[PDB]
Amino acid sequence: SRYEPVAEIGVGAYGTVYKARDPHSGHFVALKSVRVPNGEEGLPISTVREVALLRRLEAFEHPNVVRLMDVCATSRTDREIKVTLVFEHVDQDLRTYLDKAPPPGLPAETIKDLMRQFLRGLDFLHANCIVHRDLKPENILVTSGGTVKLADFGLARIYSYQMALDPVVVTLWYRAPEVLLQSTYATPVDMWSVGCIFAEMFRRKPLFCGNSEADQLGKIFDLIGLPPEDDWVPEMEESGAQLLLEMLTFNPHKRISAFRALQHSYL
Amino acid sequence: LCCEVETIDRVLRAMLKAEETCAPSVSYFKCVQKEVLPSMRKIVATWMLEVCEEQKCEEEVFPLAMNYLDRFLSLEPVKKSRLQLLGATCMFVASKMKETIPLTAEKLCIYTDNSIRPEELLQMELLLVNKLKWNLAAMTPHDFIEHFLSKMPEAEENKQIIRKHAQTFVALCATDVKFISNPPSMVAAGSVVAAVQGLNLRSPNNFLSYYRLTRFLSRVIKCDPDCLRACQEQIEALLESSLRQAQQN
């Protein structure tokens, strides 16, 4: 498989993602690249281990996560190796799905369904010890047929080196409060992003928006209310907003999980 | 693979799926290799095992590195002069995957008497990973052994003895062509079977899981119970030729 471009689907957080065609499968694919340091021991171990762990997911054939189907270290210098990641292509994200969705909802059973695949997908990820960390409506892809597929999970550590040279473009409206370290950087971080996606499906704009960490972290307390120590206008069903808060529980250790969430009255 | 609950066998089913994606070809010496022969594979494999033993590697390193070796050999013809280079690169990648402190490119070359060199190893590593498509997180017989063991009403003192014998059988298989024909699950099962049986034979009221273990693991594995049987007997045969590797000198 030598892959050949066919579009430039986006140039977000992890560089330029090209759409390419598999020349014997005929299927489309979403390519991304990453620069890695070529050490004295060859390939950086964390890259090998993390990339390998993503490659293995595909075995589970889970319907709510994009398969990483191929990897190639293409270039190579005494300081760097360039690795392209070959993902299953999904032509639209959650945005485009929410933008071409006429006034006003709509509807709930469809939002419930989305949320239900989203938590299934995430539960899968989390179980296999993979945290997304950068969950976005862009990361949330939607097939024609309504299957939500999670993408760009488990690339945080793979992209660490490249991103430290040097952006930093931090679209921050969904980041868990923790991510603004201290400290972790654990699994719950994705459930905060879930709830922020949760709300915005009934809303139509990212609650907690732009500005810096402090402005971002401030706009969170506005709706959740400041967390006394030591903690350091719904449009959906009443039951819906119940789950949402549980997700938006500023504290990780008693914030709802993707499995506990799945087992909620609202579902 | 750590669920958040206890409502969430589902694990084992996953292990079985993964292993299918990392199977070598049974006919690669015929259809792919022109120089490399099974007795050379044996040679490189026994080299690789002595290195892991000498270095006290994590048990999984040797079987994982052979999976790599058989897999590559399924995809690329290799010159017999490059085989040792391949085996060392397989160990290098397998160590990175499974060890807290992996083997260094240099230390591996030392074991080749410096017949190969680090830059050679570093260049092979990229070839190997790329060819396996970075699907390096393969199952080993050790994965299944420990899984089976967790299902068995054996006292931990029993389990540890079983574990020791079964890991011996695995290393034996990995040097043999059988490792090519049989998935890690099969290999782990034959070795567990051969282990629990031999043990029980010398301790009749102990290691009671020996009874119909083949069918049992067959059901757990979802393999053919006569395939497991053949496998085990191939393992017992292979051990009975371990007194020729003991007196090959």
Side-chain angles (χ1 to χ4, degrees), chain A, chain B residues 1-7 9-249:
Chain A
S1 294
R2 213 341 89 198
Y3 306 84
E4 286 300 305
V6 162
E8 190 181 346
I9 314 297
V11 184
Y14 294 122
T16 300
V17 42
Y18 300 86
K19 171 167 157 184
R21 184 169 182 180
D22 188 6
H24 68 244
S25 185
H27 287 268
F28 281 126
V29 160
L31 301 181
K32 300 178 192 202
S33 275
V34 59
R35 294 186 309 155
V36 304
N38 178 17
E40 173 187 347
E41 293 304 318
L43 296 172
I45 310 203
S46 296
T47 305
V48 317
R49 304 203 268 243
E50 295 279 304
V51 164
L53 279 29
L54 301 175
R55 281 293 279 115
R56 182 213 272 154
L57 281 187
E58 186 185 337
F60 295 57
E61 287 163 311
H62 194 284
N64 303 123
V65 169
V66 317
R67 305 184 300 151
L68 176 63
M69 294 177 308
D70 205 356
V71 180
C72 197
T74 72
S75 164
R76 271 179 302 176
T77 75
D78 294 349
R79 181 173 217 81
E80 287 184 3
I81 305 155
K82 185 269 206 168
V83 172
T84 95
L85 300 169
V86 181
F87 292 94
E88 191 175 15
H89 175 68
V90 180
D91 201 349
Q92 69 171 201
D93 63 319
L94 183 53
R95 287 180 303 175
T96 313
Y97 187 90
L98 280 176
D99 293 342
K100 65 182 62 181
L106 33 51
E109 302 306 61
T110 292
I111 282 171
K112 301 184 178 178
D113 171 69
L114 265 33
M115 285 295 293
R116 209 148 38 213
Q117 299 188 248
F118 184 22
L119 294 181
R120 292 195 194 116
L122 198 46
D123 180 48
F124 182 54
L125 262 40
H126 293 190
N128 293 96
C129 297
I130 118 74
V131 182
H132 198 304
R133 229 206 113 254
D134 188 21
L135 209 38
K136 298 167 183 174
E138 301 70 359
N139 296 311
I140 309 183
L141 303 193
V142 190
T143 180
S144 63
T147 305
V148 341
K149 300 271 187 179
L150 302 174
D152 289 336
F153 50 91
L155 300 183
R157 299 165 54 89
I158 285 162
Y159 275 81
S160 182
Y161 164 86
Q162 190 171 268
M163 302 186 300
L165 287 72
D166 190 359
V168 175
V169 84
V170 291
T171 302
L172 222 311
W173 332 154
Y174 302 90
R175 256 71 190 286
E178 290 156 40
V179 194
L180 206 189
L181 203 151
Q182 307 184 296
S183 278
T184 63
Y185 306 86
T187 203
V189 299
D190 289 323
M191 292 305 295
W192 182 272
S193 310
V194 178
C196 294
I197 305 288
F198 188 10
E200 174 175 351
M201 278 173 287
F202 293 115
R203 301 178 193 255
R204 263 153 291 178
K205 276 196 175 178
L207 56 169
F208 323 147
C209 269
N211 292 25
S212 186
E213 292 89 331
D215 291 308
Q216 178 53 241
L217 209 175
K219 191 170 184 180
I220 289 170
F221 296 130
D222 282 16
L223 200 175
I224 187 70
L226 190 65
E229 290 53 43
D230 311 4
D231 280 305
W232 223 280
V233 182
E235 297 74 11
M236 58 184 171
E237 278 192 336
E238 325 304 308
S239 312
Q242 315 299 329
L243 185 70
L244 183 50
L245 290 196
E246 297 184 356
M247 294 170 164
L248 298 188
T249 310
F250 175 94
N251 176 57
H253 303 294
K254 62 190 63 176
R255 170 163 55 188
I256 206 187
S257 302
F259 183 83
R260 321 173 187 176
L262 279 163
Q263 299 190 322
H264 191 254
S265 321
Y266 186 62
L267 281 77
Chain B
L1 338 82
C2 308
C3 281
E4 174 137 328
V5 184
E6 171 204 24
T7 339
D9 288 7
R10 314 298 298 119
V11 45
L12 177 53
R13 183 197 160 190
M15 298 170 72
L16 290 183
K17 290 187 182 179
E19 93 173 337
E20 301 162 1
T21 80
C22 298
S25 192
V26 74
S27 69
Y28 78 63
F29 284 105
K30 188 184 60 190
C31 307
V32 185
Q33 300 310 314
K34 305 92 156 296
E35 304 193 17
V36 161
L37 298 173
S39 66
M40 304 169 199
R41 190 205 174 260
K42 172 89 163 75
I43 284 171
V44 183
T46 164
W47 177 70
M48 295 164 72
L49 182 257
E50 293 162 352
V51 170
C52 302
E53 279 183 344
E54 199 64 56
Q55 290 305 302
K56 297 171 184 175
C57 291
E58 295 302 327
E59 275 73 2
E60 306 99 317
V61 169
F62 174 50
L64 183 59
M66 294 303 294
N67 175 269
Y68 288 171
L69 181 136
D70 292 331
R71 280 160 76 199
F72 190 74
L73 256 29
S74 291
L75 293 186
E76 280 283 311
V78 177
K79 310 188 63 183
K80 40 168 163 291
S81 79
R82 312 262 79 182
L83 194 51
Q84 173 161 249
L85 171 57
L86 173 65
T89 308
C90 293
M91 275 191 298
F92 187 66
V93 189
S95 186
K96 288 185 177 202
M97 290 293 301
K98 294 283 164 176
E99 317 207 86
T100 154
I101 308 159
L103 303 169
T104 64
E106 182 162 48
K107 217 145 298 184
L108 278 166
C109 297
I110 288 174
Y111 277 98
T112 78
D113 275 356
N114 295 308
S115 148
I116 86 163
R117 320 169 88 255
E119 326 92 48
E120 283 182 304
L121 197 91
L122 300 196
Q123 288 174 201
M124 262 295 205
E125 176 191 43
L126 291 142
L127 257 70
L128 174 67
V129 179
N130 280 338
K131 269 269 159 40
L132 307 187
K133 295 169 172 181
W134 292 65
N135 191 8
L136 312 176
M139 303 299 307
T140 72
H142 301 78
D143 290 319
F144 288 91
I145 290 176
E146 300 305 310
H147 189 79
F148 301 156
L149 271 39
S150 75
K151 301 185 66 170
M152 301 185 190
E154 302 300 340
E156 258 300 357
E157 317 89 71
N158 286 357
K159 286 186 185 174
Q160 197 37 49
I161 307 175
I162 284 173
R163 221 186 315 262
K164 191 182 61 179
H165 295 57
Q167 290 172 153
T168 289
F169 291 135
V170 179
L172 265 176
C173 284
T175 72
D176 183 72
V177 290
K178 173 177 165 32
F179 206 70
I180 308 173
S181 310
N182 301 94
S185 54
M186 277 282 283
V187 168
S191 305
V192 174
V193 171
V196 182
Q197 257 194 231
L199 289 168
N200 165 262
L201 209 41
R202 304 172 70 183
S203 195
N205 295 298
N206 226 327
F207 304 105
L208 302 180
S209 294
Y210 83 92
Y211 189 63
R212 312 188 75 191
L213 199 55
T214 295
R215 150 170 270 194
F216 184 73
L217 292 182
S218 275
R219 285 165 143 70
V220 181
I221 269 191
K222 286 88 165 187
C223 80
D224 190 340
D226 310 305
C227 291
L228 191 54
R229 189 159 294 100
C231 172
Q232 175 202 354
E233 290 167 6
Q234 298 167 16
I235 280 167
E236 299 161 2
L238 220 52
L239 179 64
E240 289 171 358
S241 306
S242 299
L243 55 83
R244 292 181 180 177
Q245 296 177 190
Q247 296 166 346
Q248 49 115 74
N249 245 7

